[PDB]
Amino acid sequence: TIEVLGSSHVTNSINNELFDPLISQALSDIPAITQYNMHVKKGIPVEDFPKTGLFPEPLNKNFSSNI
Amino acid sequence: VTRTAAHTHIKGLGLDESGVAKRVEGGFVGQIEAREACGVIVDLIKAKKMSGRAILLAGGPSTGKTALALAISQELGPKVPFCPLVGSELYSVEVKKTETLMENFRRAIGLRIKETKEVYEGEVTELTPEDAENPLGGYGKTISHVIVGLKSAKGTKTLRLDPTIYESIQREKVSIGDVIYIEANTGAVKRVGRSDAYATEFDLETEEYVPLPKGEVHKKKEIVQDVTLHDLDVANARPQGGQDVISMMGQLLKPKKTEITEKLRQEVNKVVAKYIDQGVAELIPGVLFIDEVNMLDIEIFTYLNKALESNIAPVVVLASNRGMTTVRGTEDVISPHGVPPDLIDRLLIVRTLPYDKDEIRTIIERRATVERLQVESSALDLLATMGTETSLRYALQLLAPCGILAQTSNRKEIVVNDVNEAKLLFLDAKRSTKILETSANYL
Amino acid sequence: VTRTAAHTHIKGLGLDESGVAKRVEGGFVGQIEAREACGVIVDLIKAKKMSGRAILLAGGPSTGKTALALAISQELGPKVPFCPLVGSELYSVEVKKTETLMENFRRAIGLRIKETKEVYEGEVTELTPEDAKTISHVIVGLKSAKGTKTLRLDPTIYESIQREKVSIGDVIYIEANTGAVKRVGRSDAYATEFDLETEEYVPLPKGEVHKKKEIVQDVTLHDLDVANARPQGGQDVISMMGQLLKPKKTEITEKLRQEVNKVVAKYIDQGVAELIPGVLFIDEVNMLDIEIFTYLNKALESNIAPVVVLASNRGMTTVRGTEDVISPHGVPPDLIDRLLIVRTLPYDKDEIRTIIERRATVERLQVESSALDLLATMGTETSLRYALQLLAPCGILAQTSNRKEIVVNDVNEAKLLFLDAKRSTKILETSANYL
Amino acid sequence: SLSLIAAHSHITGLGLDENLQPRPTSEGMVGQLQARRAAGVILKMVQNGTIAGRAVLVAGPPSTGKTALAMGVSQSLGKDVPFTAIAGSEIFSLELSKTEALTQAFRKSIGIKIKEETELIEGEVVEIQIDRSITGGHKQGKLTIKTTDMETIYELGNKMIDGLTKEKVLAGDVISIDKASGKITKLGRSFARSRDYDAMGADTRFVQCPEGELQKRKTVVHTVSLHEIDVINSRTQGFLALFTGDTGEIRSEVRDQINTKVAEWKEEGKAEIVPGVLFIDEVHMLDIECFSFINRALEDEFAPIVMMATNRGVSKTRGTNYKSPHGLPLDLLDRSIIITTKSYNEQEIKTILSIRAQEEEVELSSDALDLLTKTGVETSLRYSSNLISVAQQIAMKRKNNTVEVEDVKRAYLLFLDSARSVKYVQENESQYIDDQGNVQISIAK
Amino acid sequence: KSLSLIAAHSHITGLGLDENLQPRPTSEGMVGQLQARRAAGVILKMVQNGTIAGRAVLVAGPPSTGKTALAMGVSQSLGKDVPFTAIAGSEIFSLELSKTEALTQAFRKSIGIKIKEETELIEGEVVEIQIDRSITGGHKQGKLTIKTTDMETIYELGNKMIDGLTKEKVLAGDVISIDKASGKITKLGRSFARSRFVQCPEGELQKRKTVVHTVSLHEIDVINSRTQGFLALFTGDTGEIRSEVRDQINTKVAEWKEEGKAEIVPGVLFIDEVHMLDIECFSFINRALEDEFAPIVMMATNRGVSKTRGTNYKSPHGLPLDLLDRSIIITTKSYNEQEIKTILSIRAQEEEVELSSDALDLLTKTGVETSLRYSSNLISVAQQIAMKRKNNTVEVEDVKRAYLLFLDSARSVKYVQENESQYIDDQGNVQISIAK
Amino acid sequence: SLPRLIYEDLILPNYNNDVDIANKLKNVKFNIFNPSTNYELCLFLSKLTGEPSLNEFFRVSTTPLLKR
Ligand SMILES: Nc1ncnc2c1ncn2[C@@H]1O[C@H](COP(=O)(O)OP(=O)(O)O)[C@@H](O)[C@H]1O
Ligand SMILES: Nc1ncnc2c1ncn2[C@@H]1O[C@H](COP(=O)(O)OP(=O)(O)O)[C@@H](O)[C@H]1O
Ligand SMILES: Nc1ncnc2c1ncn2[C@@H]1O[C@H](COP(=O)(O)OP(=O)(O)O)[C@@H](O)[C@H]1O
Ligand SMILES: Nc1ncnc2c1ncn2[C@@H]1O[C@H](COP(=O)(O)OP(=O)(O)O)[C@@H](O)[C@H]1O
């Protein structure tokens, strides 16, 4: 952690770099019912969805976590 | 039954309660003064007070140098970290040799920590997300919260998560009817398996079936962990295990060694000292064993002079079998055991001595009775004379072909004819050199 | 107060308008011919017409080669680029040495671009966008202590505003030419909306909303070369953490340098920029390999090379990377034939005494006359640098016994405490075990 | 262009007649009649273009005009013909083998020629109306492009709608669309609409509104070397490797396939081969492995004409322990043709010095030119060439226009050549650091 | 703070000097070497004055004669907030950095910039938390009651303070510290309620805290180079920082010093075993010492007239003469027997070892005979031999037993030379067989 | 811990430093893939690679690798 005492701009920049929505969305996936909500109930087409599902697949189920 | 390899008849130094050594005890024969000196060194390590004490084991080949270090490691026990090493291993192609030496220095100081965990666990009963008002706004995720209902034994809790925890949950591929395990220290989620409250025989993906977890959903448990300083240094230099982007992409790229700075080691030392001050942690110094120390060159020796004077260094044990040889990386420096005199001034040399006919004979007896072999007395005397004539290791390594040649004749006892046949079939260094000298085309 | 480090009593070459040298001027004592030759070289650099001129200045140790190079750099001024270098710096583990040599060659050619800075800042009083789902333009109202001012804005600047989480009542910073948006913080007029808040509160600008300023930018050709040759990609303006792949140096092709050259020529043709060639200085040139010595011959024949200055203190010495090439100053005859050689003479007794007096009076120390004579007599028998380095312990020993003038007792004590090279070697020879 | 006065910038081609007969003083070259005739023969062999893989070695004493001859060949070769000039020390890379660096140097010197037809429609956007069908599968666009002189209206396809809705234009940007192919570019914003938005923005620039005809026809001829095709066809985005040099040991299959397709394109008539010259200045410091690769690499039809320059005598070839003429092994010298240069006399030195004085805009007297010629006879030639430029500044400090004898004498006193420096070192060797590091810094003993 | 078992130089707390820079015979764990300690005191005063940059000091002498101890005492007497960098000679031969780059990083790690700044902190004891949630969750209202031993107040929270209090879960009775501007909440512990444990804060709830920062030049060089993050200060792969980003830092530091916003704190760079550097490193040091932003360099070596690395000639102390022209030399001498006895008594006192007087005399005699370090090493071994016999003090017989068990250099050389057939020589010959 | 002076004088733009001006000068006004000044190079690269848009190289060269 890098801290600067008394500056909200540092906190905003650090939170933007650590939790950038484009890369965090790329390494994750949208829920299916949420996808049905924004496609059918809101009219957004498929091609302007944010890109998802780019995380690599593990070898087993056993290799998915350190616990 | 088991597998034996050049050792494992040695269990310890075999000393008394007052430090004196029995002649035949602990798998050792002879070497009384060296065993007593190693016992004094073992007591010094167990005192847990000193830093950077270094000794050197000197003597000829097949005299019992590495056996003493292995006996030291067996006498100390498994709770003390012991790091075996060979001098040729410090020459890496990814990082400089100084960093490899300092990493192996920090790998020999252990730490025992009583840490506590915050755990949410149970069987998933519901999984409903709530969407955001502007999904294509560019800033912020698609969802806002996710409602998760967990049910354990005599308990039921409902949780409201951010998208950050739910991203790891759906990376674990969590469905309805699974038993999960959320660790609040790092956000890590483990999917234990399907619950046994439903049907079992209608699956196709070799899952395991888990009963409901006992106790409440929210828990606090104490775990005793055993780590080293090098583990903390490596985990802080290459961060993994967070839920941010940087620690997530760190698990996917290829790992590589890096030159860890002194500032990171100082900060890790500060945090560890703070943990000790609260009565949580406890320091366990250990032993670093560098075998074949003549393979090092002058730069590693000059850095070792600096590294021994630090206030954290463990006990270093070296071994060498050179009389008066030139130090590697130099031309004119001739020093005993291949070790430069400024490093020799900081050591404590323990001498090892060669054996006799009786010690060779009883060592052959011990190695034969370890390997589940039955040897006659005349064959034993023949092997003892063979060992004194050529080498101890050549007599030790000829036991198993003798046993095979005895077994192939439907026999259990090893006799003189098997030893003569093994003499004929297999040679040693002196007879091979004799064949090499009287030969035509570079045999 | 002031830091003095082995130099900084040198302010210039001490030459008048006719080019001749005064004896004591600009912190220099003696050395008339080398100072006059360096003045001629300074005029040649100021003429701004040649390319690839190479001067080597040679002489014994502690005669003033590096002082002369720094005096040249002080005579030229801060506008002209000057890249000091050591010959050992050309060996790197990332690229070949010819790449590092060409980078240091292109680092010594500069540019001068006239720019302007236009800044709008103040407190937001109105943020009304309109669309046609694409926003057409955004009207933003800004307020300061001297009044208010409304603006029209680009949709891209609106996206930059929306990135920074800017609402009504914050204090922002907008540059007109670039489009950079920085959120200073919430205004202090909204400080009492809650008792506890995460937001920081700042006062109003006492200035006007609109500010204008003219600036001059100085860049080199290597800056544009490394700006156009980023291999991972163009990074953001603000990034506290680095990239996921580490970017290394690369062998930059000649095509990129040609494209940069033609772009810079087009911009020079419109009067926007001005070309200022500079000086590349390589100290301890004897440590270069034979391959770099060969590549210097090719690099000195280009159309864009700067003026190169080399220094060495060797006699008949073998060139590095060879076996049997005895050459003067450790420089092969191929490069020697392309050079001009300036000699550097040693000093007399009185010049050493005057140099010691000048080094005493820059460091704010008062020295008695007999102490000065004894220091000058010591300096003629060991070295000049030994007598120059002994002034600070003499001043400390004078300050210990509550005095402000250095007396010969302090000089004798400092001579006893600190040894020179010859007495240390005499101790080294007549000793048993590693001193 | 961006250039100052270089070492030999007075040379513009070899001064040869139509019969390959060198004039004594023409096009900036003085003397060296046989070497200039030989270089004219080599130039004619390059311009014929039917002979591949020839090695020419230029050997002479230093300061004789070997790289001046190569500069004359490069200038008289003409445009759009590749001429790669490298030094011998450039192939010792850290991220490239010597064989691969030599292959990349060899393939940079032979290129192909490609011509294409452009029908550009460059103008300023007035109004774009986007219309879609009820089904939505068909998209029509009302494009109102406008130049200064006139304005017309086009109908755009759905691919133009997709290509314009990405990097969106805002009715007043300057765009140009190719009619035949369909290249889309956004040049910037017009100067007439530069006052309405009150702030610039991050990624915008102001260009002038184009004039004249809206539709223009122009043919463009491109020259592409083989190394560009090798770099491009080896990766997903290869132009960054073209400009940053991180190609990194390209495989042989792509080179073989590129050779095959270049041959079949020459057969089809789309492209034609333009060979060129590779010049390796100071060739004597190459390894023996580089020499073996050069021996084998000259036997291919896709090989340029290689020109090498050496000023060594009978020296030791690097990577071995013996000595050879010119520092080159005998099997490479068997595969070679040697052009020999000879040292100059007084008249040629005088003419070269007068040419260099006229190049640098320096006015010399007759006596100053005679003194500089005498100095260039006694010392080398480059010493007098540098003495000219410093004597100009010395005379300029004296508030005089023409360089006199006194300025040349002062420049001779202030700056030393190699011989006086060697004498002054050898008579005072105790003050300099020796081979053993012994030196005497103290002035009294 | 600063965990450590027992160092080899742990008994030295600094130079033993009075106010007139005169050495006491025994003070602060340093015995003898009066001229060297006086010279090191003069050097320490030169560092403390701060007006002199780029001076090189060489410490030379026989091995095991107070060379590293002197630098350890100087580093102790320097105090905090002054940078001290200690590197060995063989640490700069890296694989990802050039030698001049590693030397530049080591030079710029020892110059500090002192910045003082002000901030507002709220630190108190939490009394009660009231958080109400609507059914829709559109707005969050709340009230926070916090107190010290002298005051009591109740706050009304906004939305993001409520979100930052829900995260990092704060209950009643906790002692927390809140930063208003950055929104960072640190749990200092739990107050004294038995139902880690920290006393309740006193005084005002809102306080002004002046923090003095000390940033090295290397950290600003790493941060200002945009190709690398601040994580390169910990991972270590900065990777040959470009030259042109350092002049901007130098000009900015000069501007800050002119405007009074910052102060320059020079430090000491210590190079131990300087004879292992190459000739290129010495040529780089010759020009790096003449910079204005250069620290005071202390180098130590024990060789005498040896071969300089990378060359084929011999030079005094293993260093070329142009580097020795730029240095002032401090020479250390061998120790007397009384000083050996005092040093051994200090080392025994450090390890809490009780020695008899006859054991101390035996250790002093065998330290004069062989080595100071051998007699220093024998103490802790003989102590464990004493605990084997179950007595506290260390007698003569324990020292004799430890001397019999553990050899020294000369006895090992004698045993090797008497039986050199059993060892592997320079030609790789050995005789493993006992008979014949 | 980092002081506010470094972050406010070296990284963030303000009225007394030229971070944004020099950033624009290096990355836009002297970029060699700029179609307003280097149209010939863009046309040559478009013939070479077959890109349909001539602004592709300028967008690629000023975009981070992960985002690309
Ligand atoms: N005192 C002993 N008792 C039993 N076995 C021994 C003894 N000394 C040596 N050995 C055996 O002889 C061999 C000696 O090898 P080791 O001690 O590992 O290194 P070195 O060959 O250098 O002495 C080992 O395999 C060990 O098992
Ligand atoms: N003419 C002079 N006047 C004043 N100081 C001088 C003069 N010549 C040399 N010096 C001083 O002598 C020292 C040695 O000069 P320098 O050029 O740095 O070393 P070298 O001559 O060995 O390269 C420098 O510190 C410089 O300040
Ligand atoms: N024939 C010539 N005509 C004009 N100038 C020449 C001629 N030959 C040599 N020079 C000049 O001599 C200088 C050095 O000659 P160069 O071509 O470098 O020979 P080399 O490469 O053998 O040293 C150059 O500046 C060049 O201008
Ligand atoms: N004056 C002294 N006071 C206290 N301890 C000393 C003194 N001189 C030497 N020592 C001790 O002697 C040992 C060797 O000295 P050291 O300076 O570390 O080695 P070297 O002289 O080879 O650098 C160290 O443990 C140090 O504590």
List residues bridging with B316 in a β-sheet.
B54, B288
How many helices, marked H, and strands, marked E, lie in chain C? Answer: 14, 19
- Determine contact, residues D15/D29, Cβ cutoff 8 Å: yes
Q: How many Cβ atoms are within 10 Å of B17's Cβ, its own excluded?
A: 6
Three-class DSSP category at C268: helix
Q: Do E5 and B51 touch (CB under 8 A)?
A: yes
Spatial separation of the C-alpha atoms in residues A9 and C75, rounded to whole Å = 44
Angstroms from A12 CA to nearest CA on chain B: 13
Residues in chain E with CB shorter than 8 Å from the CB of C223 are 244
Spatial separation of the C-alpha atoms in residues D58 and B358, rounded to whole Å = 82
Query: In C48-154, which ranges are continuous DSSP H helix?
Result: 65-76, 97-106
Residues 6+ apart with CB under 8 A from C82: C73, C76, C108, C278, C279, C281
**Beta-carbon pairs below 8 A across chains B and E:** 202
C-alpha B191: how far from chain center: 31
Number of the ligand closest to the Cα of D312: 3
Question: Is the CB of D67 inside a 6 Å radius of any atom of ligand 3?
Answer: yes
The two tokens of residue B186 are 């790092």
Method: cryo-EM
Spatial separation of the C-alpha atoms in residues D284 and D138, rounded to whole Å = 68
Three-class DSSP category at C355: helix
- Ligand 2: atom nearest CA of C30 is 1
**Touch between B and D (at least 3 CB pairs under 8 Å):** no
Three-state SS string across chain B, please? CCCCCCCCCCCCCCECCCCCECCEECCEECCHHHHHHHHHHHHHHHHCCCCCCEEEEECCCCCCHHHHHHHHHHHHCCCCCEEEEEHHHHCCCCCCHHHHHHHHHHCCEEEEEEEEEEEEEEEEEEEEEEECCCCCCCCCCCEEEEEEEEEECCEEEEEEECHHHHHHHHHCCCCCCEEEEEECCCCCEEEEEEECCCCCCCCCCCCCEECCCCCCCEEEEEEEEEEEHHHHHHHHHCCCCCCCHHHHHCCCCCCCCCCCCHHHHHHHHHHHHHHHHCCCEEEEECEEEEECHHHCEHHHHHHHHHHCCCCCCCEEEEEECECEEECECCCCCEEECCCCHHHHCCCCEEECCCCCHHHHHHHHHHHHHHCCCEECHHHHHHHHHHHHHCCHHHHHHCHHHHHHHHHCCCCCEECHHHHHHHHHHCCCHHHHHHHHHCCCCCC
Q: Closest Cα partner for E246 from E403, E105, E51?
A: E105
Angstroms from E75 CA to nearest CA on chain D: 34
- Residue whose Cα lies nearest atom 9 of ligand 1: it is B64
Residues in chain C with CB shorter than 8 Å from the CB of E321 are 421
Question: Is the CB of D66 inside a 6 Å radius of any atom of ligand 3?
Answer: yes
Residues in chain D with CB shorter than 8 Å from the CB of E320 are 437
- Determine contact, residues C88/E281, Cβ cutoff 8 Å: yes
Spatial separation of the C-alpha atoms in residues B340 and D305, rounded to whole Å = 59
Q: At what angle do helices E357-369 and E396-405 cross, to 10 degrees?
A: 30
Chains that touch E (3 or more CB pairs under 8 A): A, B, C, D, F
Write phi, then psi, for C340 (nearest 5 degrees).
-125, 130
Three-class DSSP category at F23: helix
A13–E contact, CB cutoff 8 A: no
Q: Closest Cα partner for D105 from D297, D326, D379, D338?
A: D297
Number of the ligand closest to the Cα of C362: 2
In D213-295, beta strands by DSSP E: 215-225, 272-275, 277-281
Angstroms from B124 CA to nearest CA on chain C: 36
C-alpha B420: how far from chain center: 42
- Determine contact, residues B83/B108, Cβ cutoff 8 Å: yes
How many angstroms is it from B64 CA to the middle of ligand 1? Answer: 4
The beta-carbon neighbor of E164 closest among C198, C392, C429 is C198
Spatial separation of the C-alpha atoms in residues C104 and D291, rounded to whole Å = 30
Q: Do E6 and B390 touch (CB under 8 A)?
A: no
How crowded is the C-beta side of E336, counted as CA atoms within 13 Å? 7
What is the identity of the amino acid at C390?
A: L
Rg (CA), chain B: 31
Spatial separation of the C-alpha atoms in residues B47 and E381, rounded to whole Å = 11
Degrees to nearest 5, angle at CA E244 with E242 and E250: 115
Three-class DSSP category at E110: coil
DSSP 8-state secondary structure symbol assigned to residue F27 = I
B244–A contact, CB cutoff 8 A: yes
Residues 6+ apart with CB under 8 A from D263: none
Task: Look at chain F and count its residues.
Answer: 68
End-to-end CA distance of chain E: 63
Question: Is the CB of C389 inside a 6 Å radius of any atom of ligand 2?
Answer: no
Spatial separation of the C-alpha atoms in residues E248 and E250, rounded to whole Å = 5
Question: Is the CB of B387 inside a 6 Å radius of any atom of ligand 1?
Answer: no
Three-class DSSP category at C255: helix
Three-class DSSP category at D133: coil
Q: Nearest residue on chain D to C42, judged by CA atoms? A: D393
C-alpha pair distances (Å), E405 with each of B29, B58, C325, D42, E398:
18, 13, 59, 86, 10
- Ligand 3: atom nearest CA of D309 is 21
- Ligand 3: atom nearest CA of D68 is 17
The two tokens of residue D142 are 């009302």
The two tokens of residue B56 are 């050197």
Angstroms from E153 CA to nearest CA on chain B: 31
For residues B202-229, b (16+ Cβ closer than 10 Å) or e, as one string? Answer: eeeeeeeeeebbeebbbeeeeeeeeebb
Spatial separation of the C-alpha atoms in residues C360 and C356, rounded to whole Å = 6
Spatial separation of the C-alpha atoms in residues A66 and C138, rounded to whole Å = 50
How crowded is the C-beta side of D303, counted as CA atoms within 13 Å? 19
Residues 6+ apart with CB under 8 A from B152: B121, B122, B123, B212, B213, B214, B215, B216, B217
C237–A contact, CB cutoff 8 A: no
Q: Do C40 and D1 touch (CB under 8 A)?
A: no
Number of the ligand closest to the Cα of B289: 1
We report the CATH number of the domain holding residue E182 as: 2.40.50.360
End-to-end CA distance of chain C: 40
The beta-carbon neighbor of C244 closest among B138, B139, B249 is B249
Residues in chain C with CB shorter than 8 Å from the CB of E101 are 92
- Determine contact, residues D389/C53, Cβ cutoff 8 Å: yes
List residues bridging with B58 in a β-sheet.
B320, B351
We report the CATH number of the domain holding residue E362 as: 1.10.8.60
- Determine contact, residues D291/D41, Cβ cutoff 8 Å: no
The two tokens of residue D19 are 């019969």
Chains that touch A (3 or more CB pairs under 8 A): B, C, E, F
Residues in chain D with CB shorter than 8 Å from the CB of F47 are 114, 116, 222
F23–D contact, CB cutoff 8 A: no
Domain limits for position D363: 346-425
Number of the ligand closest to the Cα of D35: 3
Spatial separation of the C-alpha atoms in residues E299 and E88, rounded to whole Å = 10
Q: Closest Cα partner for E194 from E176, E175, E173, E177?
A: E173
Q: Annotated binding site: which residue ranges of D? A: 60-67
Q: Which residues line ligand 4 (CB under 6 A)?
A: E 8-9, 29-33, 63-69, 302, 343, 372-373
- Determine contact, residues D72/D43, Cβ cutoff 8 Å: no
C-alpha E405: how far from chain center: 35
B225: left (phi over 0), alpha (psi -120 to 50) or beta: beta
Q: Do F1 and A4 touch (CB under 8 A)?
A: yes
Question: Is the CB of D61 inside a 6 Å radius of any atom of ligand 3?
Answer: no
Q: Closest Cα partner for C113 from D28, B99, F25, E185?
A: F25
- Determine contact, residues E132/E119, Cβ cutoff 8 Å: no
Q: At which residue do the structure tokens 């020295």 appear? A: C367
Resolution in A: 2.9
Q: Do A24 and B167 touch (CB under 8 A)?
A: yes
Those residues of chain C whose CB sits closer than 8 Å to some CB in chain F are 113, 115, 117, 119, 173, 175, 177-178, 180, 182, 211, 213, 215, 217, 219, 223-224, 227-228, 230, 232-238, 243-245, 256, 259-260, 263-264, 266-267
* Residues 317-346 of chain E whose Cβ lies under 8 A from any Cβ of chain C: 317, 321-322, 324-331
Q: Closest Cα partner for C282 from C43, C3, C22, C54?
A: C54
Q: Annotated binding site for ATP: which residue ranges of E? A: 61-68
How crowded is the C-beta side of E404, counted as CA atoms within 13 Å? 10
How many angstroms is it from D400 CA to the middle of ligand 3? Answer: 30
- Determine contact, residues C152/C213, Cβ cutoff 8 Å: no
